[PDB]
Amino acid sequence: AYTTFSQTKNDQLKEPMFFGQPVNVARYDQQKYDIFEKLIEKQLSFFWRPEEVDVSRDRIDYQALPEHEKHIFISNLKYQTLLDSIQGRSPNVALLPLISIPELETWVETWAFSETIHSRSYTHIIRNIVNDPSVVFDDIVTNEQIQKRAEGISSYYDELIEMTSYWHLLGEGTHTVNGKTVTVSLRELKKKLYLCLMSVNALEAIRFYVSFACSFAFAERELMEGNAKIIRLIARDEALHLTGTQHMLNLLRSGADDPEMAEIAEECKQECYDLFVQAAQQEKDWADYLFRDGSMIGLNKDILCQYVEYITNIRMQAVGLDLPFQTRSNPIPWINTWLVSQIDSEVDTDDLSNFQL
């Protein structure tokens, strides 16, 4: 059972990242994996508030857009709002009951908090470009193109929470709950965590960066420039986020943290590959929906789909999965701007006389 303050004195340096003894004392003078302590310090330094960005000029830019470009922008905004809505609560709900080292627990709470600032900034942008924010917000839950991916993304989160609850309440072993048999396998719990982290990695390192292209493509036309400043700040946080999930996945897969986990990583190597591939296809179909009424200067279905294939290869290789797409050059190189932020007169005739013409 989970305890908010475990009584046992454990060497936090020897605990694993997950499923070990719940953290008791939050200390930051030492780390088992210092990657997370560096991520905390960097995320704390990136602290920003949405109101400190001027977005009032974006209302004029938005109303001047063509009607199909209002669609492109406002759809990418609803999707962003949905993605960082899940990312607001889920890292705390799904990971905190499993973390067993202090530096990683605090990072997840810092990570989740920084997502709530993103959620607030989407509220800032929406209320400053459209007349009724309720129109944008109320459409996010019912919209088919988002809902399809929303329930798919939340499932890996929900299943990890559910299995975690059985693991705390009942413990490991075969149990019986109201005439039905329930088997609680820690190995299956470790498997559902790894698959969830992989899904989160694709969420933050592929899905959101596909969205970043749309937010910044307007900025390359000097349009929606208040939004772009906010999205640029988000991208700086979003780079830290995917690095966290990368180091978790790699520490698990390499067996450094848990010897059993390395085995589990190989059994999932096929599921994770199909997981990333499914995400890329979903974002491609999403691009087909964005430009269905027309394209814009610098961005169409093909350009965006090429970026999907480009960024996917990069992310999957970073977590040790085979590349699903062909090798490709960066189709939107301009996005990298936003994602990473007396003459010496003396003469010697004797020296010249040492010469035969």
């Binding site: 493509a217 390359e220 036309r221 000097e222 027309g294 394209s295 814009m296 200067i297 610098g298 961005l299 169409n300 093909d302 350009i303 050059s329 960066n330 189709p331 939107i332 190189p333 301009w334």
Partner: protein, 149 residues
């Protein structure tokens, strides 16, 4: 909004006409970006903008993207400029027959009239078989600007 075509007529602005052209000029080239050219053009649309001014802007944009990291922009900007120079002289992409052209040019006083005195129509049509207008696709951008200039 309306653009002004080469032949004076006007039609609804359609960015797909621009994607088509740039996709064509970038085909086969490595490490070039359609999106880069369009965005680096900073093409300011106004009602009645000439379609010729539009093309000259994306030529300049693609020409300034020539770099060590992206050398193949020298051919993207060349293919765009050849396409522009084809329309400037003929009104179309396809060049005319060597004889029909020389006749019109000698008649305009732009060529030397000896061309018609020394070569027959049967000989001119035989040299039109020597011509390979696809060799215009082997120039670099600096080459095309020296031709135009």
């Amino acid at each position: 909004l309306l653009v002004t075509k080469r032949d004076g007529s006007t039609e609804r602005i359609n960015l797909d006409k621009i994607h088509r052209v740039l996709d064509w000029a970038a085909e086969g080239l490595h490490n070039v970006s359609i999106s880069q050219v369009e965005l680096r053009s900073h093409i300011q649309f106004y009602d009645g903008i000439k379609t010729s001014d539009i093309h000259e802007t994306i030529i300049k944009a693609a020409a300034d993207l020539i770099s060590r990291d992206a050398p193949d922009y020298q051919y993207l900007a060349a293919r765009l400029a050849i396409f522009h120079l084809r329309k400037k002289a003929y009104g179309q992409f396809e060049p005319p027959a060597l004889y029909d052209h020389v006749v019109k040019m000698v008649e305009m006083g732009k060529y030397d009239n000896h061309l018609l005195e020394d070569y027959t129509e049967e000989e001119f049509k035989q040299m039109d078989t020597f011509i390979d207008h696809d060799r215009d696709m082997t120039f670099s951008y600096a080459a095309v600007k020296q031709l135009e200039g």
